[PDB]
Design a protein around this ligand. Structure first.
Ligand SMILES: CCCCCCCCCCCCCCCCCC(=O)OC[C@H](COP(=O)([O-])OCC[N+](C)(C)C)OC(=O)CCCCCCCCCCCCCCCCC
Ligand SMILES: CCCCCCCCCCCCCCCCCC(=O)OC[C@H](COP(=O)([O-])OCC[N+](C)(C)C)OC(=O)CCCCCCCCCCCCCCCCC
Ligand SMILES: CCCCCCCCCCCCCCCCCC(=O)OC[C@H](COP(=O)([O-])OCC[N+](C)(C)C)OC(=O)CCCCCCCCCCCCCCCCC
Ligand SMILES: CCCCCCCCCCCCCCCCCC(=O)OC[C@H](COP(=O)(O)OCCN)OC(=O)CCCCCCCCCCCCCCCCC
Ligand SMILES: CCCCCCCCCCCCCCCCCC(=O)OC[C@H](COP(=O)(O)OCCN)OC(=O)CCCCCCCCCCCCCCCCC
Ligand SMILES: CCCCCCCCCCCCCCCCCC(=O)OC[C@H](COP(=O)(O)OCCN)OC(=O)CCCCCCCCCCCCCCCCC
Ligand SMILES: CCCCCCCCCCCCCCCCCC(=O)OC[C@H](COP(=O)(O)OCCN)OC(=O)CCCCCCCCCCCCCCCCC
Ligand SMILES: CCCCCCCCCCCCCCCCCC(=O)OC[C@H](COP(=O)(O)OCCN)OC(=O)CCCCCCCCCCCCCCCCC
Ligand SMILES: CCCCCCCCCCCCCCCCCC(=O)OC[C@H](COP(=O)(O)OCCN)OC(=O)CCCCCCCCCCCCCCCCC
Ligand SMILES: CCCCCCCCCCC1=C(C)C(=O)C(OC)=C(OC)C1=O
Lengths: 98, 110, 48, 347, 169, 171, 80, 105, 314
């Protein structure tokens, strides 16, 4: 198949490995998650436009809307834990080990 | 083709103006200044109001993205269905605004 | 004023579309002959 | 929390589950999943303490990762098939990605690390809602795509889930963590029997739902969240001790109780396909679940732990909690074995 | 080299993804994500999706990454070896993949990809007096009644949920 | 698999209608009115056969009819048509409403010289009927034989023999 | 019911105007006699080709030429 | 469980999007309409087990329309042989393949 | 040949910005019973040149910026987005004819707040950051009503193309059927470019307090270019002119006069009223402008259906 498909898959894999290995902050995890969504957007849009599937052109808009609502919920959770601890570090979310 | 030429021209004109605005008084040898906000070292206070208005803007922006194809969609043959769906979407916008209004969401930044 | 001018604009659009409809059989025939010539030339050069 | 807002949010959770169940489009499956998760997040954060926000954060991150993997599998399937009908998949990579996304959503091992912490951090009612209702939609999606599921992957996930759940539940003293590890082991059983006869999977899902609902309802009726606070129940209401004894015996699969029927029919199905080592291993491993169930019954019903002085003050007042459907699911989770041929209604 | 414009843009896209995925700082990650989103919108525009690319600019960048950087400015108070190491190794795998693609005009990692320019897959015909993607999006109010209903309900419920969980009571 | 068959380069040879887009647009309505029969025959053959190699001759006839249409225009009404397509060609979007006067002059000239009447609104968008002699393609998709369906359910439903037959249960 | 409208129109006139405009917008298209004109104007716009039908012998309604009397007419659109 | 609420109730909630060969607005065809139609007319009513083996050639044609690996490979081989012959100097390109053709219409 | 078109677009923008500074000073002076600059040149015609040279030989502040990257990048983005929002403007022929030019403009205007965000974050002052956050919140909150108003106005046009907007107003001005939208659009564009009575950063720290005099001048020039662009866009939307296809100079002169009058109305507004508070303008937007914008949006969706006046798609 095509080449830009390979580049978008590799971009998605890079963002997934970024999400799956936290460094210090929760915001970097959210950024990696939203980059994953952006790669999904580009891949689906290219496939739908190249395939001339007319009625599938509405799908990336719904995908963008739902994942941005997801991101709003995640930002609210990040703000709540930052108000609790004074920072958004992932090492402070360890009370539930016990 | 012409569009990205114009974009490159605007970008290089802006960066040329910024470079001349930065580095031209750098050629002056005026002086060396020591210089030893009303708050000295206070932490930024986290305010829920600014975050709340940001998230409300984001959600209304999403429903705006939903509302955007109305000029194209008005050309459909199924006019009753399109009118009903458009009125339902803007009614949901109004209902979300009213729920934010009644539960003191728009408070102290009204 | 918007109602009258938009009805006139709709009539003009219908006229333009029906002119295109009258035209396009000839363009369809020309496009078919052109793509068949392109395929034949590519096939001959592939044979070479 | 407003009663009306709570009602709307709960119907939104059920609406998301219904949208997943009834739809023939992959995008609608995805939409129902996000609707369900977005609506269920405030049920977890009903009490507003740091533990609930931590549990909600971990749950949100896990479900978002699983959802992105699901969308990746859907887009790969569209690329290699050109359609969106919810049926067998046309790519092994899409099948693997979707199977691991559904495993992450179900919390099966080795993606199990979020289940006990999330269950511990949230109240008993929201934990019941999670561990009972949240698992109806991924098992339905698995029920729709079984011609494309890799057998080795799903069987590895099943045996890993059973062993890890038993070994994890061996060490816990909090009741919610015990319920979480029990859930992990039961989903191991359910997805073990999935590829041979999914009707057995539906029967096991129904029986596990009823037993978990009974145990959680008894827990909120007595307001106990630890082992010792449950052990105080003999000096307050001994009928509840009898009920938790019979329900925990039935949860361990001991005949002639109704919990014996799912693993009995699962072993019956697995031996028809000449698989004998795996059902024996799963039974021997489920002995561990029986072990910590029997430890709970020792601490609660078959011995009398010392009580305190204020139990008299608690004697002077009756209970007023709405123990909804508690006798019905108490009866249905213990004396249902003579009605075993009723499983033909699920085919 | 001008026929490889979408391929070059995809290379810039994945390079920006490597850069922001190394997590140097949340604000620098946001800047890298903004640049990557702009390049991806360029990819979509060069493929023919004007409306979807302008949706990416209007909603993802102008409407949502603003919220991300706005929240980033309200935390992570202003003033590494790991970041540089992963950036270098990601650039190395990326350029090794490019060299292996262009040297042999075929590659297999998980699926089989072809190293020719991506202008080959395009359609040789015209769409008439309309654009196909605009009609497909515009069919949302005529065909996608159910999609509109579930999306609007999810958005309203999201407003209610965000108002519920940030109150603290 | 097979070898795709293409017509020879002599079969694609025809003299073309070498006029620009605005020249075609100026006389588009009269071209649709006058040369309708071979155009509709070609379009019916095109939508039925789904193969341009089976519609090459109809396209050739379409070219011949269009060329004769423009030759008939050139014989009598060269100057008003030239002015009309010039003022059509000046416009960026090639509007029909910016050249009403020259359009009326050309229509009047061609009505009194050739008896031609331009169509009204919606006439050229009608669905017409075509009398042709080429036979209908009985299998235009080149589809092969469909698989045979499974046998269906027949007969009345009877109770199960000895009930469920599940272990010791007698029902 | 009557003094409430006067009080709310003296106090919040912006909301009164908004709700009145909304009610007009939601009850007027179901009441106007020009909605059918919008319907058959949108459905009479020729976007794609009117593919002809093979004449089997029994189509008196279908014209054999655009200028034939039988067929749909847009005189109502030309007059309105 | 897949509760077919739509078939029981007669509503059409997501069947319009579910395939590419369905009813599209303004009668816009897709690139692989014919191949998908042939594959669906195969697989209808025979189950997945029979349709995975019986007329698999329709699905191979549909997949070749969708992704076009064989056409890309053939073009790659033709262009590679052309490049080798051009470099070794025993092939001269024709005038119409170098931009000196003055195309038909 | 095209670069000549680009240059003759972008150099008169800077010239018009400098003379807008001069015109605003003189008009405010004559409106405050005094004179503007008339000493530096004949009627102050040499004032922008002297002011520009003085600002370009001024000592830089040399701040202790947290990030020199976005400190550089914020004026880059401000100037690029100020200059790039002119290319689909029909004058009467746009330089870049865009099928979706209106939504392209909306995307660029939504993207314009990153200059404020990065200028606030680059400066070490926390009060500067707070002022930047407040300005960003006001800007996005008025983006919302900009989008709804533009969407509701476009339903009389039929497409997103800016050149068709001349064709729509060939009969009558669009301010006749959409004057409440015109008033709300004018106030929303006034609050969009951070102008009085909404310029809160000048009332009691700006987002660019630590920026040097040169980059401050670049930011201010970008803001004035935004003002001129918005007024030209408003003139095209609501006050469309008569366009002769054989004489484009008629349309050019007509919309130039109208847009200059609208910009003079901006300067007239800025010297008549006191400033708003932050919560007062938030109240004016979320509780006054937004419900009426939604009601008028529903009205202008449902109106062309009931009037049999759907504009043509193409
Ligand atoms: C087009 C928009 C505006 C563009 C910029 C303005 C146009 C004019 C540009 C040239 C102006 C003159 C040079 C820059 C200003 C120098 C002012 C200054 O402080 O000079 C003293 C300075 C330093 O003189 P100094 O040696 O006496 O130092 C005094 C300072 N102490 C003692 C503390 C060290 O002069 C310079 O830096 C010389 C700069 C170049 C001189 C001109 C070269 C040719 C230019 C054509
Ligand atoms: C609250 C929901 C209010 C609107 C309900 C739908 C109104 C409507 O126009 O329905 C006809 C429309 C469209 O009918 P139609 O007849 O215009 O469609 C013809 C068929 N197509 C789409 C190909 C043109 O919807 C349906 O008929 C089915 C979809 C909606 C079914 C009801 C969903 C309710 C969900 C409640 C939760
Ligand atoms: C581009 C063309 C030119 C535009 C105008 C330019 C010149 C005029 C400039 C004016 C001054 C600008 C500077 C100040 C800006 C800030 C103040 C401001 O604008 O505040 C807005 C004010 C703010 O309102 P407010 O704050 O006074 O409201 C009081 C609210 N409480 C009580 C809660 C405090 O008004 C509006 O928002 C109204 C917007 C326009 C409404 C248009 C309605 C049209 C008619 C509808 C129908 C009515 C009849 C009833 C229904 C009939 C149904 C059939
Ligand atoms: C094998 C599985 C992983 C495959 C990708 C590996 C990328 C290179 C990583 C090398 C190891 C770097 C490391 O130690 O990362 C840990 C770090 C989180 O740890 P932190 O808190 O930042 O610091 C403690 C460091 N021990 O975590 C990170 O910094 C995560 C950064 C991931 C960046 C991936 C970039 C793309 C890699 C190529 C494509 C896949
Ligand atoms: C193939 C299968 C397809 C699907 C088939 C059907 C599946 C049905 C699945 C049922 C899932 C039940 C989920 C959990 C209960 C949902 C209702 C709810 O929200 O209950 C919690 C609620 C919280 O209220 P609150 O007052 O805060 O409680 C704290 C204690 N004071 O209220 C309370 O806590 C009140 C206290 C009593 C709660 C009792 C709830 C019992 C629910 C389970 C009933 C039995 C299972 C369903 C029937 C059999 C299905 C197989
Ligand atoms: C059914 C029609 C279509 C409906 C859907 C479309 C709606 C479009 C407009 C959307 C508006 C969204 C926001 C609405 C908020 C209303 C609630 C509210 O604000 O109540 C508070 C307010 C009193 O103000 P206060 O409590 O002091 O708040 C601080 C501001 N002063 O309370 C008030 O000022 C009183 C508000 C309620 C009464 C308004 C009555 C208006 C009647 C107009 C004539 C009838 C119109 C026809 C429709 C029926 C209306 C009942
Ligand atoms: C699109 C159009 C844009 C237009 C932009 C500009 C608008 C304003 C145009 C200029 C208006 C008039 C300016 C007059 C300036 C003063 C001229 C003058 O007489 O200066 C005299 C001064 C001293 O002379 P001195 O010899 O010492 O006198 C003793 C003799 N008794 O000698 C000096 O100071 C030295 C010589 C100075 C000469 C200055 C000449 C004017 C400079 C204008 C710059 C911009 C020109 C336009 C650029 C854009 C168009 C090309
Ligand atoms: C190699 C040789 C060249 C070397 C480099 C020099 C280039 C040319 C620089 C400008 C000309 C040099 C002389 C500058 C002025 C000197 C004479 C002077 O002082 O004139 C004073 C006179 C006004 O007198 P004043 O003292 O103000 O009295 C007030 C009234 N009672 O003032 C006036 O009448 C007006 C003076 C105007 C000065 C010229 C116009 C401004 C500069 C234009 C060119 C540079 C800027 C171009 C645009 C940049 C972008 C804005
Ligand atoms: C910190 C980094 C630097 C920051 C400053 C510089 C970047 C930000 C400021 C500039 C922003 C530029 C935005 C460019 C895209 C805008 C959308 C667009 O191109 O629309 C025009 C057109 C679509 O309209 P339409 O009429 O349908 O097309 C012709 C159809 N016959 O589409 C076309 O005509 C398509 C033409 C071919 C494709 C062009 C692709 C352009 C290059 C990719 C994006 C460049 C910007 C990347 C960075 C973003 C911001 C970080
Ligand atoms: C290419 C560079 C052109 C020159 C720069 C822009 C024009 C100069 C603006 C100077 C200026 C003037 C005249 C001015 O009057 C003013 O006060 C409102 C400013 O802000 C404090 C200014 O920045």
């Amino acid at each position: 198949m095509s080449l830009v498909y390979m580049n978008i898959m590799m971009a998605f894999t890079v963002s997934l490995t970024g999400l799956l290995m936290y460094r210090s902050h929760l915001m970097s995890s959210l950024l990696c998650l939203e980059g994953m969504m952006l790669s999904l957007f580009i891949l689906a849009t290219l496939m739908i436009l190249n395939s001339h599937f007319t009625l599938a052109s509405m799908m990336p808009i719904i995908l963008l809307v739902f994942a941005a609502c997801e991101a709003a919920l995640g930002l609210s959770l990040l703000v709540m834990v930052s108000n609790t601890y004074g920072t958004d570090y992932v090492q402070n979310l360890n009370l539930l080990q016990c | 083709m012409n569009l990205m030429i114009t974009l490159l021209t605007n970008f290089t004109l802006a960066t040329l103006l910024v470079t001349i605005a930065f580095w031209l008084p750098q050629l002056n040898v005026y002086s060396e200044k020591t210089s030893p906000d009303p708050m000295g070292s206070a932490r930024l206070p986290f305010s829920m109001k600014f975050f709340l208005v940001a998230i409300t803007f984001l959600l209304f922006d999403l429903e705006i993205a939903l509302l955007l194809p109305l000029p194209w969609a008005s050309q459909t043959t199924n006019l009753n269905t399109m009118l009903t769906m458009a009125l339902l979407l803007i009614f949901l916008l109004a209902v979300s605004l009213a729920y934010e209004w009644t539960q003191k969401g728009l408070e102290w930044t009204e | 004023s918007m109602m009258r001018w938009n009805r006139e604009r709709r009539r003009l659009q219908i006229e333009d579309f029906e002119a295109r409809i009258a035209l396009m059989p000839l363009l369809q025939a020309e496009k078919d002959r052109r793509v068949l010539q392109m395929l034949r030339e590519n096939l001959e050069e592939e044979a070479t | 929390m407003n009663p009306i807002i709570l009602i709307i949010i709960l119907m939104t959770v059920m609406l998301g589950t219904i949208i997943v169940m009834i739809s023939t489009h992959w995008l609608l499956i995805w939409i129902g999943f996000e609707m369900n998760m977005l609506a269920i997040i405030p049920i977890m954060m009903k009490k507003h303490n740091p533990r609930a926000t931590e549990a909600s954060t971990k749950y949100f991150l896990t479900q978002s990762t699983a959802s992105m993997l699901l969308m990746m599998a859907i887009i790969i399937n569209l690329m290699f098939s050109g359609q969106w009908t919810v049926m067998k998949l046309f790519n092994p990579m899409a099948s693997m990605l979707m199977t691991m996304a559904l495993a992450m959503k179900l919390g099966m091992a080795p993606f199990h690390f979020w289940v006990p912490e999330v269950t511990q951090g949230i109240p008993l009612s929201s934990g019941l809602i999670l561990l009972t209702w949240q698992k109806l939609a991924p098992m339905s999606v698995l029920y729709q795509i079984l011609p494309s599921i890799n057998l080795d992957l799903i069987l590895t996930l099943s045996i890993l889930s059973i062993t890890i759940g038993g070994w994890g539940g061996l060490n816990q003293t909090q009741l919610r963590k015990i319920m979480a590890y029990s859930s992990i082991a039961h989903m191991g059983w359910m997805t073990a029997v999935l590829l041979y006869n999914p009707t057995m999977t539906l029967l096991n899902l129904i029986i596990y739902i009823i037993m978990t609902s009974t145990m959680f309802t008894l827990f909120m009726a007595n307001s106990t969240t630890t082992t010792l606070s449950l052990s105080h129940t003999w000096n307050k209401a001994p009928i509840m001790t009898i009920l938790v004894l019979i329900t925990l015996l039935s949860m361990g699969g001991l005949p002639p109780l109704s919990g014996f029927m799912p693993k009995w029919m699962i072993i019956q199905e697995m031996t028809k396909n000449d698989s004998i080592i795996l059902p024996t291993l799963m039974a021997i491993t489920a002995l561990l679940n029986l072990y910590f169930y029997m430890r709970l019954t020792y601490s609660t019903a078959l011995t009398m732990f010392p009580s305190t002085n204020n139990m008299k003050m608690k004697w002077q007042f009756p209970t007023t909690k709405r123990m909804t459907l508690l006798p019905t699911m108490t009866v249905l989770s213990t004396m249902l074995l003579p009605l075993t041929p009723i499983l033909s209604i699920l085919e | 080299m001008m026929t490889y414009i979408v391929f070059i843009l995809s290379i810039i896209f994945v390079m920006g993804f490597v850069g922001f995925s190394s997590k140097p700082s949340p604000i620098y990650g946001g800047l890298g994500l903004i640049v990557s989103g702009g390049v991806g919108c360029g990819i979509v525009l060069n493929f023919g999706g004007s409306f979807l690319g302008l949706m990416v600019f209007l909603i993802y960048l102008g409407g949502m990454m603003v919220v991300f950087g706005y929240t980033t400015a309200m935390a992570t108070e202003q003033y590494n070896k790991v970041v540089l190491g992963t950036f270098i190794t990601g650039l190395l795998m990326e350029f090794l993949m490019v060299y292996y693609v262009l040297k042999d005009k075929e590659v297999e990692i998980v699926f089989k990809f072809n190293g020719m320019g991506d202008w080959v897959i395009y359609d040789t015909g015209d769409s008439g007096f309309f654009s196909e993607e605009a009609m497909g999006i515009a069919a949302l109010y005529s065909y996608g009644t159910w999609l509109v209903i579930v999306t609007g309900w999810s958005l309203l419920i999201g407003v209610v949920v965000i108002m519920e969980i940030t109150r603290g009571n | 698999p097979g070898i795709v068959e293409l017509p020879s380069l002599e079969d694609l040879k025809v003299q073309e209608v070498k006029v620009s887009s605005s020249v075609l647009k100026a006389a588009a309505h009269h071209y649709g009115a006058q040369c309708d029969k071979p155009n509709k025959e070609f379009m019916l053959c095109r939508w039925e056969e789904k193969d341009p190699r089976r519609c090459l001759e109809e396209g050739k006839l379409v070219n011949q009819c269009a060329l004769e249409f423009f030759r008939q225009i050139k014989r009598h009404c060269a100057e008003p048509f030239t002015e009309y397509w010039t003022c059509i060609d000046y416009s960026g979007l090639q509007l029909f409403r910016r050249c009403r006067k020259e359009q009326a002059q050309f229509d009047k000239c061609v009505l009194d010289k050739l008896g031609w009447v331009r169509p009204d609104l919606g006439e050229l968008s009608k669905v017409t009927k075509v009398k042709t002699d080429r036979p209908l393609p009985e299998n235009p998709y080149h589809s092969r034989a469909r698989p045979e369906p499974n046998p269906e359910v027949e007969g009345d439903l009877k109770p199960a023999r000895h009930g469920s037959r599940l272990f010791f249960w007698t029902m | 019911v009557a003094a409430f409208l006067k009080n709310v129109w003296a106090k919040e006139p912006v909301l009164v105007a908004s709700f009145a405009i909304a009610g007009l917008a939601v009850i007027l298209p179901t009441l106007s006699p020009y909605t059918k004109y919008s319907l058959m104007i949108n459905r009479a716009t020729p976007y794609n080709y009117p593919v002809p039908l093979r004449d089997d012998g029994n189509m008196p309604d279908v014209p054999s030429h655009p200028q034939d009397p039988q067929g749909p007419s847009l005189e109502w659109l030309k007059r309105l | 469980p897949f509760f077919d609420v739509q078939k029981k109730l007669g509503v059409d909630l997501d069947h319009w999007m579910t395939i590419q060969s369905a009813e599209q607005p303004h009668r816009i065809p897709a690139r692989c309409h014919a191949f998908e139609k042939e594959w669906i007319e195969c697989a209808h009513g025979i189950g997945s087990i029979r349709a995975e083996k019986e007329c698999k050639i329709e699905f191979e044609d549909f997949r070749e329309c969708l992704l076009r690996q064989k056409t890309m490979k053939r073009l790659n081989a033709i262009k590679r042989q052309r490049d080798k012959l051009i470099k070794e100097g025993k092939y001269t390109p024709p005038p119409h393949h170098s931009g000196q053709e003055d195309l038909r219409p | 040949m095209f670069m000549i078109n680009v240059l003759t677009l972008i150099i008169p923008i800077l010239l018009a910005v400098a003379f807008l500074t001069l015109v605003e000073r003189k008009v405010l002076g004559y409106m405050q019973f005094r004179k503007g600059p008339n000493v530096v040149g004949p009627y102050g015609l040499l004032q922008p040149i002297a002011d520009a040279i003085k600002l370009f030989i001024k000592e830089p502040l040399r701040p202790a910026t947290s990030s020199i990257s976005m400190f550089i990048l914020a004026p880059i983005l401000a100037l690029t987005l100020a200059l790039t929002m002119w290319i689909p403007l029909p004058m009467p022929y746009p330089l870049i004819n865009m099928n979706l030019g209106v939504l392209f403009m909306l995307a660029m205007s939504s993207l314009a707040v990153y200059s404020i965000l990065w200028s606030g974050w680059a400066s070490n002052s926390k009060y500067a950051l707070i002022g930047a956050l407040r300005a960003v919140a006001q800007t996005i909150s008025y983006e919302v009503t900009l989008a709804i108003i533009l969407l509701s106005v476009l339903l009389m046009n039929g497409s997103f193309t800016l050149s068709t907007l001349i064709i729509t107003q060939e009969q009558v001005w669009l301010i006749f059927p959409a004057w409440p939208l015109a008033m709300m659009w004018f106030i929303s564009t006034l609050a969009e470019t951070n102008r009085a009575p909404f310029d809160l950063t000048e009332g009691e720290s700006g987002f660019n307090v630590e920026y040097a005099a040169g980059p401050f001048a670049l930011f201010f020039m970008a803001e004035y270019a935004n003002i001129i662009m918005m007024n030209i866009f408003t003139t095209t939307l609501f006050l469309g002119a008569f366009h002769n296809p054989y004489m484009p100079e008629l349309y050019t002169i007509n919309f130039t006069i109208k847009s200059l009058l609208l910009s003079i109305t901006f300067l007239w507004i800025r010297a008549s009223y006191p400033r708003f508070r932050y919560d007062q303008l938030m109240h004016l937007l979320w509780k006054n402008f937004l419900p009426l914008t939604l009601a008028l949006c529903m009205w202008h969706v449902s109106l062309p259906i009931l009037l049999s006046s759907i504009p043509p798609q193409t």
